[PDB]
Structures are given as structure tokens and as C-alpha cells.
Design a protein around this nucleic acid. Structure first.
Ligand SMILES: [Zn+2]
Lengths: 148, 92
DNA sequence: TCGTGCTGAGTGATATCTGCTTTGGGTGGGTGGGTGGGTTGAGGCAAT
DNA sequence: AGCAGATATCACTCAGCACGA
């Protein structure tokens, strides 16, 4: 009746494959191999990789909304919405069974008390001096930090 | 091309409706000689308004009243029901 | 003067289709403004 | 994609008459 993420009270993270363990079992550890910002290309998208560099900027901790809870003035029921994007369109009209049945036009109002939020921080990582080629300018890559 | 919701005789006669009013309307309503007249009027209107809301959320109270009026004037089944009620009470 | 349809066209109303425009950046302009943002670098000028 | 204006097709109210009571 409610999204699974709403009641979750934990965060999940992946620890890269240690080089020692990979070499013990005769395997290559792509995830734990350090890379520069330049070496991160478009073919690496969607993979678990490691980046080596110097942090140049960290933003303030802000709440990022994941599940939004609404209320019906007429119905008396609660609605939920899942956010997985930069932007979202708020609900305006009730979708409950009661409302629908009865034909009652009830407006939805946002409720921040019952919503789910996660701490968000945006950081910038820049190339080290020894990683830049000859006659090149350093590059930076954005970092998104969520949870604990 | 969408059927409108109406306070039909069917509705009125359901378990949530007139039978509901008869079953539990003396317990909740109480006119007190020690209370102000406005308070008694508000209590009666409170009970009937909550019942109406439960029954037929679309309309307001006054609107509900009006609708009730028209339904009662028009519907022949409702008339039967009412008469039945009255008859059964007169037989007691 | 109540009840029950049959007629009815009027007075709605609400469920239902037809056209912008936007972000921001010169792939809309300077007869939309510079107090709605951009905006660091070079250049010419007056007071110094 | 979202929003504001508009068209047109959807019902509902007061209107009034025939039968009989
Ligand atoms: Zn509702």
C-alpha cells in the first residue's frame, strides 16, 4: 500500500574489491583501481569505479526529498509520491477510491512531517598536479553524497 | 458522458441512511433545558450534518436539505418507506 | 388542491479539444530594457 | 510537458398540461 523506500531506516553502500583479495583469487579489481578525472570516460558510466583527487568544494548539507506525503481535506486519506529526478510535479487532485466513488473533488496538500528526506551534499574533486599531462589544464568531476 | 451522483431513494433507504438515523439518533442528540437554545440547535445540526456527510459527501448541509426536500416530494418508494415507518409506530 | 408522468427549450456546467512558450543564450533581437540575470579583459579617458 | 482559452455536447430546473381525487 506504501512504497518500500518509505519505511526503510537504513542506507546501502558498496565497498570496492580490495586489490589484495582480487590477486589472491586471480582476478582483476576494476572498481578499486584508482583513476584520474580524465580516465573517466563515457564507457565507464553505470559502473563502480574509484577516483583519486583533491576535494576543492563541499556544499552545505540539505534535505533531498525521496517520498512525498499528501493529505485529502475531504477524504481523510493519505497519498504518497516517489521522487527519482531533479524535479517533480506535485499532485493536485485526490485519487483515492472513496473520492472517486463519491465524486468528491478534494485537493491534495503537501505534508513535510510524514515525508522522507535524506541528507544531500555536492562536492567537487579536481585532478592532482602529477596526473595532468604536459600542457593541459586540470579537470574536475562532480560528486553526490547521500545518506550517512 | 459521466453519470452524476444523486441522492436517490436507493441511497436513502440503505443501511447507511434513514435506518441509520432511526437506529441511533436519540442517543447522540439531546436537547437540554440547562443549555442555551443556540447550543441545542447546533447539537442537532451537528448530528444531522455528520450523518449527511457520511451519506452523501458531495453536497453541503443546506444543499442536502434541499435535495432531501425534492427527493421526498418526487420518489414513490421513499413515500412508501415513510408511511411504513409511521404505520408501524402507530401500531405500537 | 397532491401525484405522476409527458414535453420542453431554456439555462446552464463540466467534461472535453486547440495553440503557445518555456530554458536561458546569442541557432529570437537592440523600436522589450540595463534596477530580471550574464561579467572578466582590453581599451580609452580624466583627474592625479 | 504544462498551462490558459475555447468549443460543443452533456444534464438538469422550472415550466404547465392531462387525469382523478
Ligand atoms: Zn480524497
Amino acid at each position: 500500500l506504501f512504497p518500500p523506500n518509505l519505511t526503510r531506516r537504513y542506507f546501502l553502500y558498496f565497498k570496492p574489491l580490495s586489490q589484495n583479495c582480487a590477486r589472491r583469487y586471480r582476478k582483476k579489481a576494476i572498481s578499486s583501481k584508482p583513476l584520474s578525472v580524465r580516465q573517466i570516460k563515457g564507457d565507464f558510466l553505470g559502473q563502480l569505479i574509484t577516483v583519486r583527487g583533491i576535494i576543492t568544494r563541499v556544499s552545505d548539507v540539505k534535505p533531498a526529498v525521496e517520498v512525498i506525503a499528501y493529505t485529502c481535506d475531504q477524504c481523510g486519506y493519505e497519498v504518497f509520491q516517489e521522487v527519482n529526478s531533479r524535479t517533480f510535479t506535485p499532485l493536485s487532485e485526490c485519487t483515492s477510491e472513496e473520492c472517486s466513488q463519491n465524486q468528491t473533488k478534494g485537493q491534495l496538500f503537501m505534508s513535510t512531517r510524514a515525508s522522507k528526506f535524506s541528507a544531500f551534499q555536492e562536492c567537487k574533486i579536481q585532478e592532482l598536479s602529477q596526473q595532468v599531462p604536459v600542457g593541459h589544464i586540470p579537470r574536475s568531476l562532480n560528486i553526490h553524497v547521500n545518506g550517512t | 458522458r459521466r453519470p452524476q451522483v444523486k441522492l436517490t431513494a436507493e441511497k436513502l433507504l440503505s443501511d447507511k441512511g434513514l435506518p441509520y438515523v432511526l437506529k441511533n439518533a436519540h442517543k447522540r442528540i439531546r436537547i437540554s433545558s440547562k443549555k442555551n437554545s443556540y447550543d441545542n440547535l447546533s447539537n442537532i445540526i451537528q448530528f444531522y450534518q455528520l450523518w449527511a456527510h457520511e451519506l452523501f459527501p458531495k453536497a453541503k448541509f443546506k444543499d442536502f436539505m434541499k435535495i432531501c426536500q425534492t427527493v421526498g416530494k418526487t420518489d414513490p418508494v421513499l413515500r412508501e418507506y415513510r408511511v411504513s415507518l409511521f404505520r408501524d409506530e402507530m401500531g405500537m
